[PDB]
Design an enzyme around this catalytic site. Structure first.
Site, PDB file in Angstrom:
ATOM      1  N   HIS A  43       1.417   3.798  -3.362  1.00  0.00           N
ATOM      2  CA  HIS A  43       0.637   5.045  -3.321  1.00  0.00           C
ATOM      3  C   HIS A  43       1.465   6.293  -3.670  1.00  0.00           C
ATOM      4  O   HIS A  43       0.968   7.431  -3.592  1.00  0.00           O
ATOM      5  CB  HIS A  43      -0.028   5.223  -1.965  1.00  0.00           C
ATOM      6  CG  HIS A  43      -1.332   4.500  -1.852  1.00  0.00           C
ATOM      7  ND1 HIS A  43      -1.505   3.216  -2.326  1.00  0.00           N
ATOM      8  CD2 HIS A  43      -2.532   4.888  -1.358  1.00  0.00           C
ATOM      9  CE1 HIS A  43      -2.748   2.834  -2.103  1.00  0.00           C
ATOM     10  NE2 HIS A  43      -3.394   3.832  -1.525  1.00  0.00           N
ATOM     11  N   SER A  79       5.464  -3.258 -13.932  1.00  0.00           N
ATOM     12  CA  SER A  79       6.350  -3.134 -12.793  1.00  0.00           C
ATOM     13  C   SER A  79       7.792  -2.903 -13.219  1.00  0.00           C
ATOM     14  O   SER A  79       8.473  -2.028 -12.691  1.00  0.00           O
ATOM     15  CB  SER A  79       6.245  -4.391 -11.924  1.00  0.00           C
ATOM     16  OG  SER A  79       7.325  -4.493 -11.025  1.00  0.00           O
ATOM     17  N   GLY A 127       0.963  -7.548 -14.514  1.00  0.00           N
ATOM     18  CA  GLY A 127       1.684  -6.805 -13.499  1.00  0.00           C
ATOM     19  C   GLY A 127       3.191  -6.728 -13.725  1.00  0.00           C
ATOM     20  O   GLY A 127       3.820  -5.711 -13.443  1.00  0.00           O
ATOM     21  N   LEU A 178      -5.309  -3.245 -11.621  1.00  0.00           N
ATOM     22  CA  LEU A 178      -4.954  -4.597 -11.223  1.00  0.00           C
ATOM     23  C   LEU A 178      -4.349  -4.590  -9.819  1.00  0.00           C
ATOM     24  O   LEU A 178      -4.333  -5.630  -9.163  1.00  0.00           O
ATOM     25  CB  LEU A 178      -3.993  -5.269 -12.223  1.00  0.00           C
ATOM     26  CG  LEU A 178      -2.530  -4.849 -12.342  1.00  0.00           C
ATOM     27  CD1 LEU A 178      -1.654  -5.617 -11.350  1.00  0.00           C
ATOM     28  CD2 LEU A 178      -2.029  -5.055 -13.769  1.00  0.00           C
ATOM     29  N   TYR A 179      -3.899  -3.435  -9.325  1.00  0.00           N
ATOM     30  CA  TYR A 179      -3.158  -3.458  -8.072  1.00  0.00           C
ATOM     31  C   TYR A 179      -4.089  -3.156  -6.866  1.00  0.00           C
ATOM     32  O   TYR A 179      -3.619  -2.971  -5.743  1.00  0.00           O
ATOM     33  CB  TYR A 179      -2.054  -2.401  -8.106  1.00  0.00           C
ATOM     34  CG  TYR A 179      -0.690  -2.832  -7.577  1.00  0.00           C
ATOM     35  CD1 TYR A 179      -0.498  -3.223  -6.261  1.00  0.00           C
ATOM     36  CD2 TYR A 179       0.415  -2.823  -8.417  1.00  0.00           C
ATOM     37  CE1 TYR A 179       0.742  -3.618  -5.804  1.00  0.00           C
ATOM     38  CE2 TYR A 179       1.666  -3.193  -7.965  1.00  0.00           C
ATOM     39  CZ  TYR A 179       1.820  -3.596  -6.643  1.00  0.00           C
ATOM     40  OH  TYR A 179       3.038  -3.977  -6.113  1.00  0.00           O
ATOM     41  N   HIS A 189      -7.176  -5.358  -2.237  1.00  0.00           N
ATOM     42  CA  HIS A 189      -7.860  -5.278  -0.955  1.00  0.00           C
ATOM     43  C   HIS A 189      -8.187  -6.633  -0.279  1.00  0.00           C
ATOM     44  O   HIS A 189      -8.361  -6.650   0.935  1.00  0.00           O
ATOM     45  CB  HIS A 189      -9.125  -4.435  -1.103  1.00  0.00           C
ATOM     46  CG  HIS A 189      -8.847  -3.031  -1.540  1.00  0.00           C
ATOM     47  ND1 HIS A 189      -9.046  -2.601  -2.834  1.00  0.00           N
ATOM     48  CD2 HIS A 189      -8.344  -1.968  -0.864  1.00  0.00           C
ATOM     49  CE1 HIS A 189      -8.704  -1.328  -2.931  1.00  0.00           C
ATOM     50  NE2 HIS A 189      -8.272  -0.923  -1.753  1.00  0.00           N
ATOM     51  N   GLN A 215       0.824  -1.212   0.000  1.00  0.00           N
ATOM     52  CA  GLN A 215       0.000   0.000   0.000  1.00  0.00           C
ATOM     53  C   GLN A 215       0.859   1.263   0.000  1.00  0.00           C
ATOM     54  O   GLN A 215       0.603   2.195  -0.759  1.00  0.00           O
ATOM     55  CB  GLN A 215      -0.949   0.015   1.194  1.00  0.00           C
ATOM     56  CG  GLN A 215      -1.962   1.132   1.110  1.00  0.00           C
ATOM     57  CD  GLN A 215      -2.918   1.162   2.288  1.00  0.00           C
ATOM     58  OE1 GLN A 215      -2.692   0.512   3.305  1.00  0.00           O
ATOM     59  NE2 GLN A 215      -4.013   1.902   2.143  1.00  0.00           N
TER      60      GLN A 215
HETATM   61  C1  COH Z   1      -1.307  -2.387  -2.376  1.00  0.00           C
HETATM   62  C2  COH Z   1      -2.479  -2.853  -2.016  1.00  0.00           C
HETATM   63  C3  COH Z   1      -3.409  -2.097  -1.138  1.00  0.00           C
HETATM   64  C4  COH Z   1      -3.632  -2.209   0.298  1.00  0.00           C
HETATM   65  C5  COH Z   1      -2.951  -3.049   1.342  1.00  0.00           C
HETATM   66  C6  COH Z   1      -4.723  -1.223   0.470  1.00  0.00           C
HETATM   67  C7  COH Z   1      -5.222  -0.967   1.810  1.00  0.00           C
HETATM   68  C8  COH Z   1      -6.402  -0.168   2.058  1.00  0.00           C
HETATM   69  C9  COH Z   1      -6.967  -0.122   3.418  1.00  0.00           C
HETATM   70  C10 COH Z   1      -6.446  -0.825   4.615  1.00  0.00           C
HETATM   71  C11 COH Z   1      -5.459  -0.324   5.330  1.00  0.00           C
HETATM   72  C12 COH Z   1      -8.156   0.704   3.294  1.00  0.00           C
HETATM   73  C13 COH Z   1      -9.149   1.111   4.349  1.00  0.00           C
HETATM   74  C14 COH Z   1      -8.086   1.044   1.841  1.00  0.00           C
HETATM   75  C15 COH Z   1      -9.113   1.883   1.248  1.00  0.00           C
HETATM   76  C16 COH Z   1      -8.943   2.520  -0.043  1.00  0.00           C
HETATM   77  N1  COH Z   1      -7.979   2.144  -0.918  1.00  0.00           N
HETATM   78 CO1  COH Z   1      -6.609   0.764  -0.788  1.00  0.00          CO
HETATM   79  N2  COH Z   1      -5.188  -0.552  -0.628  1.00  0.00           N
HETATM   80  C17 COH Z   1      -4.396  -1.102  -1.587  1.00  0.00           C
HETATM   81  C18 COH Z   1      -4.466  -0.737  -2.990  1.00  0.00           C
HETATM   82  C19 COH Z   1      -5.156   0.470  -3.428  1.00  0.00           C
HETATM   83  C20 COH Z   1      -4.941   1.011  -4.795  1.00  0.00           C
HETATM   84  C21 COH Z   1      -4.031   0.526  -5.887  1.00  0.00           C
HETATM   85  C22 COH Z   1      -5.844   2.157  -4.812  1.00  0.00           C
HETATM   86  C23 COH Z   1      -6.111   3.197  -5.865  1.00  0.00           C
HETATM   87  C24 COH Z   1      -5.296   4.410  -5.387  1.00  0.00           C
HETATM   88  C25 COH Z   1      -5.525   5.650  -6.233  1.00  0.00           C
HETATM   89  O1  COH Z   1      -5.982   5.514  -7.386  1.00  0.00           O
HETATM   90  O2  COH Z   1      -5.252   6.776  -5.760  1.00  0.00           O
HETATM   91  C26 COH Z   1      -6.432   2.097  -3.463  1.00  0.00           C
HETATM   92  C27 COH Z   1      -7.421   3.094  -3.110  1.00  0.00           C
HETATM   93  C28 COH Z   1      -8.238   3.041  -1.912  1.00  0.00           C
HETATM   94  C29 COH Z   1      -9.359   4.008  -1.738  1.00  0.00           C
HETATM   95  C30 COH Z   1      -9.857   5.102  -2.659  1.00  0.00           C
HETATM   96  C31 COH Z   1      -8.740   6.126  -2.857  1.00  0.00           C
HETATM   97  C32 COH Z   1      -9.239   7.544  -2.706  1.00  0.00           C
HETATM   98  O3  COH Z   1     -10.446   7.778  -2.944  1.00  0.00           O
HETATM   99  O4  COH Z   1      -8.422   8.426  -2.342  1.00  0.00           O
HETATM  100  C33 COH Z   1      -9.845   3.640  -0.413  1.00  0.00           C
HETATM  101  C34 COH Z   1     -10.983   4.226   0.381  1.00  0.00           C
HETATM  102  N3  COH Z   1      -6.057   1.101  -2.631  1.00  0.00           N
HETATM  103  N4  COH Z   1      -7.056   0.530   1.096  1.00  0.00           N
HETATM  104  C1  LIG Z   2      13.615  -6.221 -12.150  1.00  0.00           C
HETATM  105  C2  LIG Z   2      12.537  -6.999 -11.453  1.00  0.00           C
HETATM  106  C3  LIG Z   2      11.175  -6.405 -11.685  1.00  0.00           C
HETATM  107  C4  LIG Z   2      10.445  -7.084 -12.810  1.00  0.00           C
HETATM  108  C5  LIG Z   2       9.359  -8.014 -12.343  1.00  0.00           C
HETATM  109  C6  LIG Z   2       9.030  -9.017 -13.407  1.00  0.00           C
HETATM  110  C7  LIG Z   2       8.655 -10.267 -13.131  1.00  0.00           C
HETATM  111  C8  LIG Z   2       8.509 -10.787 -11.739  1.00  0.00           C
HETATM  112  C9  LIG Z   2       9.838 -11.381 -11.410  1.00  0.00           C
HETATM  113  C10 LIG Z   2       7.507 -11.901 -11.695  1.00  0.00           C
HETATM  114  C11 LIG Z   2       6.290 -11.790 -11.155  1.00  0.00           C
HETATM  115  C12 LIG Z   2       5.779 -10.508 -10.572  1.00  0.00           C
HETATM  116  C13 LIG Z   2       4.590 -10.702  -9.677  1.00  0.00           C
HETATM  117  C14 LIG Z   2       3.439  -9.962  -9.773  1.00  0.00           C
HETATM  118  C15 LIG Z   2       2.936  -8.873 -10.726  1.00  0.00           C
HETATM  119  C16 LIG Z   2       2.220  -7.738 -10.061  1.00  0.00           C
HETATM  120  C17 LIG Z   2       2.799  -6.716  -9.431  1.00  0.00           C
HETATM  121  C18 LIG Z   2       4.282  -6.566  -9.261  1.00  0.00           C
HETATM  122  C19 LIG Z   2       4.586  -5.768  -8.027  1.00  0.00           C
HETATM  123  C20 LIG Z   2       5.854  -4.973  -8.132  1.00  0.00           C
HETATM  124  C21 LIG Z   2       5.659  -3.500  -8.341  1.00  0.00           C
HETATM  125  O1  LIG Z   2       4.773  -2.904  -7.740  1.00  0.00           O
HETATM  126  O2  LIG Z   2       6.396  -2.865  -9.119  1.00  0.00           O
END
Ligand code: COH
Ligand SMILES: CCCCC/C=C\[C@H](C)/C=C\C/C=C\C/C=C\CCCC(=O)O
Ligand code: COH
Ligand SMILES: *[C@@H]1O[C@H](CO)[C@@H](O[C@@H]2O[C@H](CO)[C@@H](O)[C@H](O)[C@H]2NC(C)=O)[C@H](O)[C@H]1NC(C)=O
Ligand SMILES: *[C@@H]1O[C@H](CO)[C@@H](O[C@@H]2O[C@H](CO)[C@@H](O)[C@H](O)[C@H]2NC(C)=O)[C@H](O)[C@H]1NC(C)=O
Ligand SMILES: CCCCC/C=C\[C@H](C)/C=C\C/C=C\C/C=C\CCCC(=O)O
Ligand SMILES: CCCCCCCCO[C@@H]1O[C@H](CO)[C@@H](O)[C@H](O)[C@H]1O
Ligand SMILES: *[C@@H]1O[C@H](CO)[C@@H](O)[C@H](O)[C@H]1NC(C)=O
Ligand SMILES: *[C@@H]1O[C@H](CO)[C@@H](O)[C@H](O)[C@H]1NC(C)=O
Ligand SMILES: *[C@@H]1O[C@H](CO)[C@@H](O)[C@H](O)[C@H]1NC(C)=O
Ligand SMILES: *[C@@H]1O[C@H](CO)[C@@H](O)[C@H](O)[C@H]1NC(C)=O
Lengths: 552, 552
Positions: free
Chosen positions: A176, A499, A495, A353-354, A357, A172
């Site tokens: 972000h 990435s 992804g 895709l990311y 939640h 997260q």
């Molecule tokens: C990496 C994965 C991940 C996690 C662990 C996570 C953890 C949590 C979490 C628990 C702590 C809560 C309560 C939320 C709640 C939200 N997340 Co995420 N989120 C996650 C990926 C995202 C992504 C990607 C977006 C879109 C962000 C953007 O577009 O700004 C997101 C956006 C949100 C939004 C809308 C964005 C906005 O309107 O500003 C809310 C609400 N959330 N998220």
């Molecule tokens: C040089 C190494 C980087 C290239 C990765 C390329 C292939 C890797 C090995 C294989 C699988 C990656 C796994 C998940 C894809 C989603 C999100 C990725 C999260 C990572 C992110 O948020 O950027």
């Protein structure tokens, strides 16, 4: 009306209308010719027959552990294989970028306007008869229906790869900085104009914000001490704007680079760690360069922390997510004799895709307490009560949820899951199978092939009727996972290329940047080249607690 | 006090302080090692022995006309040679960019802030004892004395390569889309945030300005018809902001992309031609695509005009300036199997070297009239009086001035030449010989070697004492020209790599853009690939008058 509405061009050929009722495919450099670019050239047929499927490759990388540990201990060989990993992913991303939510054809506006997320696939034209183009019904199934029947969590489904809450909150926190949707403009727009890993979530997006966060002594960031411990400064102290509910007391309004990181104590945990790391690197650099001023100490520390982040993301984070026995390597030199663009534009689909939640647990378990979502959100007194050490220890033990496999989105964030569906449609995303073809994956031929099961598949079939009408985002969360994996094929294969560009595309990885002098000399360089999630915590958290991205 | 003040690192090694009075050179990938990076690696000794000097290669390219006439007619061979021309220039430019006026070390601020011109050489540090570092006197010689003794024009010296006023105004018009200094911030800042050939000088830098210039029918730009002839619209009609003196009547305040193009009728001539070209290309595209809307017609025409510009700049403009018998070729495909970054950041030194004011005559001769500077400036009634056809015919006949060789800056613009000097100093430019070493040229060892003569050289020696203290800008304008050429060695060897990145670095030259569907199909593609300065004039100026960048 648009004759390109059915997506007739295959294999990355581009469709252009040539009249009200006719189209033409541009097959330039696709390896295919013919009306829809479906007739392969001779060398193309060879390469297709040789190329193994992503599921075949995934099997090899996740089995034969004995062989991989031999390979990992041979530097030359490990480097060679990593070079392959880096370059096999390369061909998928358009760089310079092409489409965005408003442009389904290439234009200077789409290239030059950095406020847009870019698009791996152009949007469905406004005047297409159906949301996906020509297939399906006039309207997509109710998003609340999709959500309730196949996305919402019943019982918590733990991740079988053992991802923990250090991982979830790292995901997260890290993401972000470049997923920062500008809701005033709409879902296809971003405030992250750096379009990558610039650590604006620590340092601020603008110079003005950055200067308000800086101490202007020794390169350091401002901080406060609470109970002998270093935390970020407050809003009152910095005049940095943050997003807080009105009931939050002034002494608990922490000011950090990213305006929403007061949302959850998990984000604030990482903001604190990275703030501490910056000032730590400042001390090391001042030690090495007593002749340096505040400005250069600050700038060189920021370059080093960008380095550490990319290092950690590749060798710990992506390493954990991949499930590979092969040990990934952050090594910019591996691309120096390869064709590669040191630039990046963040894709809308990467953002979509990311949305991981399902990762989130039903409660957040710190020491002996179990906080609900309601107790957890916007409550940094939790962080002060327990401290960073206890946070790390607790989050390292707590298991995160499985993302693929369906029905594991916690209901506390159902509105976010529902908006992902609604905003994907609003941005006119193409279908799941269009995105699979775009990334060289075989289209699914039924809902059962997609899910690997029969119940959710039947529910999806009653909603969507046609598999070619299935949408990208819900599909990602219901897809059949790899064996005991957190993700399905589509998540990984979409992804990885996005990435790769975000990480290796950074200017510090380019030849003119990647040398010790960029980083204050060999001492600064070594900080990048030895970073790990464990050393990050060990240097910056009292007690040096063990940490990892998986439960033990 | 800074130990790097003397520029001790050679061969592009980077200098870093390691204490108050010590430094270390980073020799990474320079091909050299040792304390100042002067000890060549074995492969380096070889390349050094083989690689011919720039004056030698230039001799070969401007002689053996018979041999070049064979080569030019062998497509495979001509392509191969242009490929070397393109790639031999690549290794000189930092891309991603590095320094700027405020940062003599790499930093995220310097990389990310697009408001700066970038810098091919870092600035001299503020605390160096002398303007050039450690050499020379505490202050550089009076800029007024330099200006008057070796830059100011006595008698008009015509360009021996025959450059005409079509060429001079083309140069001014074209470059002023990316040389756009933001004087509110300082000389090291630009308003051209696209940092290249985006034709903002036609379409406007910002979206709001673009929309004010557009007709929003058929993709076209707004225009007016005066005496049956198409000209730009007025400020009164469009609300587009332009720079005009208060005495200029409303009927004569033409509104075009670039706010300063009302300055001289020569700029307005080209603005009118390109306006005509855009709307012409709209007509062609509408014929090919009756189903297209205004937005796509506009965007595709812009991409095509970007294409035409780069085509004309390489195969007419650079072709003329070079003096080469070899026929240069605009062909993006030549780099597709090469390492090359499709991006560009406009360099400050590129701006500085391109101050080609000796080009300007003492009077501007249109038909039988001769306008002084005072009569010519901000006077678009001259364009209306004579019309575009007469302008072209006249500017094609009038000889431009020689730029290198000294004493040919027209007095009417002496304030500008003096500012080029003063601002180079304010921006803390390094010495002439430093920039020569930076671009693989041998440093001059005396002023007579620089000028090729004795009078100006003796004048310069009394002013500067040491050749190592000679500055870049004045050196360019007093330098010994190539035999009957407009420029000396330094102008060409610095200009070519900057120019290369500006032109080939454009996204439309990248593999994903360079295909017919980007440009509306084969018809649009053909417009780019057949463009010439003559076809530009012939398609848009009544009578199709002959034109050329040289006198006949
Ligand atoms: C990496 C994965 C991940 C996690 C662990 C996570 C953890 C949590 C979490 C628990 C702590 C809560 C309560 C939320 C709640 C939200 N997340 Co995420 N989120 C996650 C990926 C995202 C992504 C990607 C977006 C879109 C962000 C953007 O577009 O700004 C997101 C956006 C949100 C939004 C809308 C964005 C906005 O309107 O500003 C809310 C609400 N959330 N998220
Ligand atoms: C040089 C190494 C980087 C290239 C990765 C390329 C292939 C890797 C090995 C294989 C699988 C990656 C796994 C998940 C894809 C989603 C999100 C990725 C999260 C990572 C992110 O948020 O950027
Ligand atoms: C071939 C190149 C060329 C030509 C033909 C040319 C023709 C003329 C010309 C003939 C009618 C006149 C009266 C001028 C007068 C000026 N030129 Co030029 N200039 C040229 C290259 C430049 C360059 C390069 C700059 C710096 C532009 C910038 O940074 O904005 C320039 C800037 C100027 C400036 C300063 C702009 C400012 O301070 O904002 C004046 C005044 N001028 N120039
Ligand atoms: C990038 O594109 C967006 C979308 O077109 C631009 O935002 C629009 O700006 C105009 C004025 O220029 C406003 O009237 C619109 O309301 C804006 N639309 C949206 C959806 O926000 C934005 O200005 C562009 N950015 C640049 C630098 O050109
Ligand atoms: C790019 O750099 C310039 C120069 O530092 C920034 O302009 C300064 O911004 C501060 C704070 O906003 C102002 O107080 C100064 O007056 C500005 N100085 C100059 C010389 O203009 C500019 O904001 C930077 N751009 C970005 C996007 O960070
Ligand atoms: C692909 C061809 C472009 C590469 C050119 C590279 C080498 C050419 C051949 C040789 C000499 C160029 C002449 C002058 C340099 C100054 C200014 C240039 C003005 C041009 C400009 O303003 O960009
Ligand atoms: C948190 C669950 C909310 C479900 C409310 C809508 C009911 C639709 O969900 C139903 O519920 C069951 C889930 O176990 C499944 O057996 C059915 O297939 C599914 O259709
Ligand atoms: C692909 O081409 C065939 C004939 O070549 C045509 O019938 C078909 O309609 C094309 N594809 C689409 C999606 O229209
Ligand atoms: C905030 O966290 C504290 C623990 O420090 C807890 O006692 C309190 O109930 C929480 N506040 C809310 C509104 O949940
Ligand atoms: C270059 O190195 C030599 C020794 O190799 C040293 O004497 C000299 O000081 C260095 N250059 C400069 C400018 O100091
Ligand atoms: C402007 O040009 C016209 C020629 O059309 C000339 O008669 C007039 O005197 C000029 N104005 C100035 C102020 O020089």
């Amino acid at each position: 009306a648009n004759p390109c509405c059915s997506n007739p061009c295959q294999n990355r050929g581009e469709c252009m209308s040539t009249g009200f009722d006719q189209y033409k495919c541009d097959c330039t450099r696709t390896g295919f010719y013919g009306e829809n670019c479906t007739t392969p050239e001779f060398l193309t047929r060879i390469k297709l027959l040789l190329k193994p499927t992503p599921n075949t490759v995934h099997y090899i990388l996740t089995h034969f552990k004995g062989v991989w540990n031999i390979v990992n201990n041979i530097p030359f060989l490990r480097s060679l294989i990593m070079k392959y990993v880096l370059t096999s992913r390369s061909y998928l991303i358009d760089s310079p970028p092409t489409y965005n939510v408003h442009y389904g054809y290439k234009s200077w506006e789409a290239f030059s306007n950095l406020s847009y997320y870019t698009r791996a696939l152009p949007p469905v034209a406004d005047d297409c008869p159906t949301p996906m183009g020509v297939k399906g019904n006039k309207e997509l199934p109710d998003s609340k229906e999709v959500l309730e029947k196949v996305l919402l969590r019943r019982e918590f489904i733990p991740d079988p790869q053992g991802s923990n809450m250090m991982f979830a909150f790292f995901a997260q926190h890290f993401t972000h900085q470049f997923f920062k949707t500008d809701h005033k403009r709409g879902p296809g727009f971003t405030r992250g104009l750096g379009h990558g890993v610039d650590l604006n979530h620590i340092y601020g997006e603008t110079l003005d914000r950055q200067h308000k966060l800086r101490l202007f002594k020794d390169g350091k960031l401002k901080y406060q001490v609470i109970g002998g411990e270093v935390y970020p400064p407050t809003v009152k102290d910095t005049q940095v704007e943050m997003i807080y509910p009105p009931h939050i007391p002034e002494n608990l309004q922490f000011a950090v680079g990213q305006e929403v990181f007061g949302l959850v104590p998990g984000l604030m945990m990482y903001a604190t760690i990275w703030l501490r790391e910056h000032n730590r690197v400042c001390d090391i650099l001042k030690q090495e360069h007593p002749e340096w001023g505040d400005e250069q100490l600050f700038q060189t520390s920021r370059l080093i922390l960008i380095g550490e982040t990319i290092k950690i993301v590749i060798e710990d984070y992506v390493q954990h997510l991949s499930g590979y026995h092969f040990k990934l390597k952050f090594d910019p030199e591996l691309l120096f004799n390869q064709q590669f663009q040191y630039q990046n534009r963040i894709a809308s689909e990467f953002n979509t895709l990311y949305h991981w939640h399902p990762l989130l647990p039903d409660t957040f378990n710190i020491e002996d307490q179990e906080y609900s979502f309601k107790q957890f959100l916007y409550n940094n007194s939790i962080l002060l009560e327990h401290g960073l050490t206890q946070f790390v220890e607790s989050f390292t033990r707590q298991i995160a949820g499985r993302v693929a496999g369906g029905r594991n989105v916690p209901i506390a964030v159902q509105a976010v899951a529902k908006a992902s569906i609604d905003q994907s449609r609003e941005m006119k995303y193409q279908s799941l199978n269009e995105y699979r073809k775009r990334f060289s994956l075989k289209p699914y031929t039924s809902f059962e092939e997609l899910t690997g099961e029969k119940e959710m598949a039947a529910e999806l079939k009653a909603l969507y009727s046609d598999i070619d009408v299935m949408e990208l985002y819900p599909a990602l969360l219901v897809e059949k996972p790899r064996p005991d994996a957190i993700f399905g094929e589509t998540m990984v294969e979409l992804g990885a290329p996005f990435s790769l560009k975000g990480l290796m595309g950074n200017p510090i990885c380019s030849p003119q940047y990647w040398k010790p002098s960029t980083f204050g000399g060999e001492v600064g360089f070594k900080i990048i080249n030895t970073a790990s999630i464990q050393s990050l915590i060990c240097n910056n958290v009292k007690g040096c607690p063990f940490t990892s991205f998986n439960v033990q």
